[PDB]
């Protein structure tokens, strides 16, 4: 359950990220691939090397999904429904992996947001990404 | 866990710049704020009611300093983490019964603290090297459960 | 997301359990204490030995909460709200521990429901207990 | 992992009654049904569209038999699970990249299968002994990640 303060904090952080969101999404993915190599197996058709257009493209989409969630934070199950279907039914993404990308998203924000990444905002962002992850893993059948 | 020479270089180079009087306190405090169930183990620390109270709590800072001292000791013995953490494993597992998932969480919090402190210098390969380290420390600290 | 078939399966299983629910709750707790000794630290004021009146009493309450969830399966966040407050705020129960008790509840049902514990019903029950666990861990702050 | 003589007794006594041609298939099938992301690794097995298709799938039964064979091998070497599972660790970790959480899940599924098969005989202490075993096998199978 995201509190009013959590929603404030998350909106504030993503505001600062501003138009770098796409680039940061790509960076978080790269961090995940390097830190947690088991995650790479979902992307056999990707070149995952640094500067990859495919990782960049996906990073933009990931950022777009997260922004959609922020923008509709009280309706996240609905907002992310199609994405939850994709990740569970078609992609068969192990639920563990959401915690890995979530961590890498936090790290990326921390590396780019010196002023904003306070302990409180850190906590709010973690709750937000946990909420997103919960929706994205809600559709296994 | 097996760090390559390049990974060892990345880790030791960054660590030399860490303020060891602060970073441990920062990581422990954020653990208590972000994963509030962990406060269960620190009832004697007093005021943990708000993020500011946690972060400014002198016992949090003091204890964090000890935690970081143990990470430093692991960094100096990357090829014998089990032995290095043996007595701490008995304490955290046999005596405290902390679920070992929380060892992973603290390690990941430390990684976030390093990213915040070092910014662009905390590159994706540098992080990957650090993830090997904190995974190793967590696994060693959890040995008594295994 | 519990499907219509999941809800059917769960209602069917708990119907068979019938009035043994309280006893089974106590058994699941005992299984947890023996299998996962870290869980025992939440109960320093309990005698956890076999036949303990305190474990029996708690088992009845646990069963009652689960039955309440089954009975209001489309409104579980509301139904279990007070319990989620208790387990997060007051008890500071590590979220990992919900997976442990959930497993022990499944084992207990399996040990008592030869006909009902089919792979499909097993899957439905796992989803149900995961849903309960999700609500019970939604209130950390 | 350290089993007491009473725990070893509990485990071996029950295991002697296990149908080793079926139970592995039953556990693997339930893994695929209950945790459907695991189906990702078994695309070549064919029809996994329904629980009945999974459970009746001859390749699921055949493969489960192999899995159970490995559990049996661990039961015969409880004090050297690492060595016993070394080549399987390389396969599951280095080659397949299965997340080790799934090793824990399969172990817990096996426990549910044993409970279903043995009923009241699968007592809480018997389960506790088996949890030590499956945790040990999971940790050994995951050694290449450590
Ligand atoms: C915050 C968590 C996540 C978000 C917001 C997210 C979002 C997205 C989005 C928006 C797409 C593009 C969908 C489309 O093109 O129609 C996508 C694709 C994909 N995602 Fe995720 N995802 C997340 C976590 C993960 C994780 C943890 C994994 C696996 C480790 C994963 C694996 C994939 C794969 C394999 C694709 C397909 C890429 C392709 O073939 O083009 N996702 N995701
Ligand atoms: C990598 C993870 C961790 C490391 C390296 C670590 C390290 C340490 C160190 C060096 C001490 C001081 C022991 C002494 O006084 O000799 C300590 C004590 C303690 N730790 Fe940790 N720790 C970790 C994780 C945790 C976690 C996650 C918790 C709880 C959530 C925890 C709870 C405690 C408690 C309650 C004490 C005080 C024990 C006592 O004085 O009796 N630790 N730890
Ligand atoms: C399906 C999951 C769970 C359910 C449905 C559940 C339900 C309940 C209920 C109904 C109560 C009684 C509340 C009252 O008396 O007002 C309770 C108390 C309690 N629960 Fe849980 N619980 C669950 C999981 C857990 C877990 C995993 C733990 C820790 C390992 C835990 C620890 C406790 C503790 C320490 C109490 C207080 C007992 C006392 O002091 O009397 N619960 N729970
Ligand atoms: C305790 C846990 C497990 C044990 C003891 C186990 C054991 C085995 C055994 C004995 C084999 C046969 C290897 C051979 O042909 O020599 C095998 C193969 C295989 N396992 Fe597992 N396994 C476990 C968990 C898992 C899980 C959780 C997955 C995926 C979710 C998985 C995926 C596979 C795959 C895809 C193969 C075929 C590899 C190949 O033939 O190339 N295993 N495993």
Structure tokens at B80: 């014998």
- Cβ-defined contact of B124 to A118 (cutoff 8 Å): no
Nearest to B37 by CA among C126, D129, D46, C42: C42
* Lookup result for tokens 């008790």: C101
PDB experimental method: X-ray
- Domain encompassing residue B136: 1-146
Torsion angles phi and psi, residue B78, rounded to 5? -60, -20
d(CA C50, CA C56): 9
Structure tokens at C124: 């439905």
Interacting residues of C117 by C-beta distance below 8 A, sequence separation 6+: C13, C109, C110, D112, D116
Q: What resolution in angstrom units was achieved for this structure?
A: 1.8
Atom of ligand 2 nearest to the CA of B98: 29
DSSP collapsed to 3 states, chain B? CCCCHHHHHHHHHHHCCCCCCCHHHHHHHHHHHHCHHHHHHHHHHCCCCCHHHHHHCHHHHHHHHHHHHHHHHHHCCCCCHHHHCHHHHHHHHHHCCCCCHHHHHHHHHHHHHHHHHHHHHCCHHHHHHHHHHHHHHHHHHCHHHC
- How far, in Å, is the centroid of ligand 1 from the Cα of A102? 12
- What residues of B are in contact with residue D135 (Cβ under 8 Å)? 146
* Whether the Cβ atoms of residue D113 and residue D30 lie closer than 8 Å to each other: yes
- How far, in Å, is the centroid of ligand 1 from the Cα of A43? 10
* Whether the Cβ atoms of residue B122 and residue B17 lie closer than 8 Å to each other: no
Angstrom distances, CA of residue D57 to CA of C128, D54, D107:
26, 5, 21
d(CA A53, CA C79): 48
* Whether the Cβ atoms of residue D72 and residue D15 lie closer than 8 Å to each other: yes
Atom of ligand 1 nearest to the CA of A132: 1
The CATH number of the domain holding residue D133 is 1.10.490.10
- Cβ-defined contact of C92 to B36 (cutoff 8 Å): yes
d(CA B127, CA A131): 25
* Lookup result for tokens 């869980």: C39
- Cβ-defined contact of D124 to C123 (cutoff 8 Å): no
**What class, spelled out in words, does domain C1-141 have in CATH?**
mainly alpha
B/e letters for D77-115, b = 16+ CB within 10 Å, e = fewer, are ebeebeebbeebbeebbeeeebbbebbbbbbbbbbbbbb
Instruction: Count the Cβ atoms, other than its own, within 10 Å of residue B51.
Output: 19
Structure tokens at D76: 């015969």
Which ligand places an atom closest to the C-alpha of A129? 1
Angstrom distances, CA of residue B64 to CA of B57, B104, B132:
11, 16, 21
Judged by DSSP in three states, C1 sits in coil
d(CA C21, CA C66): 9
Which ligand places an atom closest to the C-alpha of A134? 1
d(CA A141, CA D36): 7
Domain count, chain D: 1
Residues in chain A: 141
Interface test with C, best of B35, B99, B101, B138 (most C CBs within 10 A): B99
Structure tokens at C62: 């646990």
d(CA A24, CA D20): 51
B/e letters for C75-92, b = 16+ CB within 10 Å, e = fewer, are ebeebbeebbeebbeeeb
- How far, in Å, is the centroid of ligand 4 from the Cα of D92? 6
CA atoms lying within 13 Å on the CB side of residue B113: 25
Query: What are the pocket residues of ligand 3 if the criterion is a CB atom closer than 6 Å to any ligand atom?
Result: C 39, 42-43, 58, 61-62, 65-66, 83, 86-87, 91, 93, 97-98, 101, 132, 136
Enclosing H/E stretch for C107: helix C96-112
**CA D125 to mean position of chain CA atoms:** 19
**CA C102 to mean position of chain CA atoms:** 6
Torsion angles phi and psi, residue D47, rounded to 5? -70, 110
d(CA C75, CA D65): 42
Judged by DSSP in three states, A52 sits in coil
d(CA C39, CA C29): 10
Choose the closest CB to C110 out of D34, D55, D115: D115
Nearest to C66 by CA among C55, C79, C51, C53: C79
Angstrom distances, CA of residue A48 to CA of A93, B87, B132:
18, 41, 20
How far B90 CA lies from chain D's nearest CA (Å)? 14
Tally A–B CB contacts below 8 A.
58
Angstrom distances, CA of residue C42 to CA of B32, B97, C93, C105:
18, 10, 8, 18
C82-C86-C91 Cα angle (round to 5): 170
Structure tokens at A7: 């929603």
Q: How deeply is B129 buried, as exposed, middle or buried, from its count of CB atoms within 10 A (0-12, 13-18, 19+)? A: buried
The answer for B99, left when phi > 0, alpha when psi is -120 to 50, beta otherwise, is beta
Tally B–C CB contacts below 8 A.
26
Angstrom distances, CA of residue B55 to CA of A8, B48, B58, B103, C89:
21, 9, 8, 20, 20
Q: Which of C22, C35, C45, C65 for mutating ligand 3's site (highest number of atoms within 8 Å of CB)?
A: C65
């Amino acid at each position: 359950v995201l509190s009013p303060a959590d929603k404030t904090n998350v909106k504030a952080a993503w505001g600062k990220v501003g138009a770098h969101a796409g680039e940061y999404g790509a960076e978080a993915l790269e961090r995940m691939f390097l830190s947690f190599p088991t995650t790479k197996t979902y992307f056999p058709h990707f070149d995952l090397s640094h500067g990859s257009a495919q990782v960049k493209g996906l990073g933009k989409k990931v950022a777009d999904a997260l922004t959609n969630a922020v923008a509709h934070v009280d309706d996240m199950p609905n907002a992310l429904s199609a994405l939850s279907d994709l990740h569970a039914h078609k992609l068969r993404v192990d639920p563990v992996n959401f915690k890995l990308l979530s961590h890498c998203l936090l790290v990326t924000l921390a590396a780019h947001l010196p002023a904003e990444f306070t302990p409180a905002v850190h906590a709010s962002l973690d709750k937000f990404l946990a909420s997103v992850s919960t929706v994205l893993t809600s559709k296994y059948r | 866990v097996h760090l390559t020479p390049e990974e060892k270089s990345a880790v030791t180079a960054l660590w030399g710049k860490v303020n060891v009087d602060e970073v441990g306190g920062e990581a422990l405090g954020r653990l208590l704020v972000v994963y509030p169930w962990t406060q269960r183990f620190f009832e004697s620390f007093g005021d943990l009611s708000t993020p500011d109270a946690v972060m400014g709590n002198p016992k949090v800072k003091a204890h964090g300093k000890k935690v970081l001292g143990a990470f430093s000791d692991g960094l100096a013995h990357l090829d014998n983490l089990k032995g290095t953490f043996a007595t701490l494993s008995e304490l955290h597992c046999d005596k405290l019964h902390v679920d070992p998932e929380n060892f992973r969480l603290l390690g990941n919090v430390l990684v976030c603290v390093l990213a915040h402190h070092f910014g662009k210098e905390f590159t994706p390969p540098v992080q990957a090297a650090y993830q090997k380290v904190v995974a190793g420390v967590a696994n060693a600290l959890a040995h008594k459960y295994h």
